[PDB]
Amino acid sequence: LHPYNSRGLFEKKLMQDNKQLYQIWIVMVWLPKNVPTSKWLNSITSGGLKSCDLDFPLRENTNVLDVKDKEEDHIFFKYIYELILAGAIDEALEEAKLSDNISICMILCGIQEYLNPVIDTQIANEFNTQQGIKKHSLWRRTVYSLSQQAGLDPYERAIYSYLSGAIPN
Amino acid sequence: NTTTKILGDKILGNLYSKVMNNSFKLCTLLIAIRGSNRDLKPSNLEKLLFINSSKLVDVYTYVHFKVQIIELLSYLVEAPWNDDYPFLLSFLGEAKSMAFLKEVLSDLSSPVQDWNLLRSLYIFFTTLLESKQDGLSILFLTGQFASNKKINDESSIDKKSSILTVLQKNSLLLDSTPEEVSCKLLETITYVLNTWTNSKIFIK
Numbered sequence: 001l002h003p004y005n006s007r008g009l010f011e012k013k014l015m016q017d018n019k020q021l022y023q024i025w026i027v028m029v030w031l032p033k034n035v036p037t038s039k040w041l042n043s044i045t046s047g048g049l050k051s052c053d054l055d056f057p058l059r060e061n062t063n064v065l066d067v068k069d070k071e072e073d074h075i076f077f078k079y080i081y082e083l084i085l086a087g088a089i090d091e092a093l094e095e096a097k098l099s100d101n102i103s104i105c106m107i108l109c110g111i112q113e114y115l116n117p118v119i120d121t122q123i124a125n126e127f128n129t130q131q132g133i134k135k136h137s138l139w140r141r142t143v144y145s146l147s148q149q150a151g152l153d154p155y156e157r158a159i160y161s162y163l164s165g166a167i168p169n
Numbered sequence: 170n171t172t173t174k175i176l177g178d179k180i181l182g183n184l185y186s187k188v189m190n191n192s193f194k195l196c197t198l199l200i201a202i203r204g205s206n207r208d209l210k211p212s213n214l215e216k217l218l219f220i221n222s223s224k225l226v227d228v229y230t231y232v233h234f235k236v237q238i239i240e241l242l243s244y245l246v247e248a249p250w251n252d253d254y255p256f257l258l259s260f261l262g263e264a265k266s267m268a269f270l271k272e273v274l275s276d277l278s279s280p281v282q283d284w285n286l287l288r289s290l291y292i293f294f295t296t297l298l299e300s301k302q303d304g305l306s307i308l309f310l311t312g313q314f315a316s317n318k319k320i321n322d323e324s325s326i327d328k329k330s331s332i333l334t335v336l337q338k339n340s341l342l343l344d345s346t347p348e349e350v351s352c353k354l355l356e357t358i359t360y361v362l363n364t365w366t367n368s369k370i371f372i373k
Contacts, residue, residue, distance in 0.1 A: 032175075032230065032263075032264040033170075034172070036173045037173065056321065094170065097172070098172050
């Protein structure tokens with residue numbers, strides 16, 4: 001427990017050694033589509049595309065790829081906002097993955113703190129491999145820049161508010 | 170859930186299911202034999218149990234498969250499961266769900282209006298009418314599902330310990346198709362209507 005830890009055992013001890021914060025966490029947490037995936041065909045042909053990624057969307061217009069998955073960044077994110085107060089984020093991961101996103105779904109694996117048999121000793125036994133981010137605080141302040149990003153329309157970011165603690169957007 | 174579930178490939182479905190579909194019949198062979206009790210068993214009792222296998226479900230939005238879902242639960246109950254019920258239903262995969270499982274007691278005929286000759290009729294009884302106790306017998310044939318609980322008082326109100334309030338259902342699972350699974354319980358149920366005093370609260 002004690003002697004030297006990652007960030008994973010800190011968070012456990014926090015919740016251990018108070019019980020009004022632990023209840024506060026439990027309150028907020030307590031209260032289907034078929035998508036074939038793929039992109040990047042139709043984009044190069046009309047104009048430019050030039051590099052494949054949903055970071056092309058962020059260098060300029062968000063009309064540059066297929067626009068029936070521009071649909072999905074509104075709509076399946078709306079499903080995700082019902083989900084996060086029904087609890088979890090790995091639930092929301094499984095729906096992000098049907099949203100035709102597959103590198104913007106890495107942000108929901110980002111929310112994990114470092115759980116490791118190299119730096120935890122009671123989380124070294126329900127895992128035998130590295131999990132999460134050990135730069136989880138630079139992750140938190142960088143997913144918080146998106147909560148204010150003004151290129152990001154509100155139907156993406158409102159969960160990026162919430163991933164770093166929720167401004168009411 | 171459904172990702173890439175298409176009216177192109179419905180060919181992948183005879184792959185994705187049919188892997189664990191072998192595992193099914195390797196088990197439920199052991200009970201089906203009826204006349205020559207117990208067979209080869211891998212260990213597989215411990216395996217394939219609980220919330221698990223079921224996750225294949227949602228093809229109820231698109232077909233890769235659409236009848237291979239129905240199998241699991243009907244198969245995955247075994248003879249030692251006349252004492253306890255592992256949790257092969259209670260929670261299931263994203264979105265949609267098996268619910269054509271009591272339309273194996275009847276026809277599957279409720280969507281179409283014609284009977285499509287649904288296979289499972291057999292293997293459904295292989296483990297319904299040959300495996301006792303709250304589980305598949307509080308869900309089908311009287312009850313409402315939340316197993317190993319049924320007290321009509323008639324027996325202790327303590328959390329099962331004296332067992333005559335639940336036998337009343339399992340007595341209608343004692344049929345001749347059962348071999349030895351039935352053949353001690355047939356002596357347990359004699360009590361319920363036994364004239365000495367027993368039929369004074371036991372005729373529920």
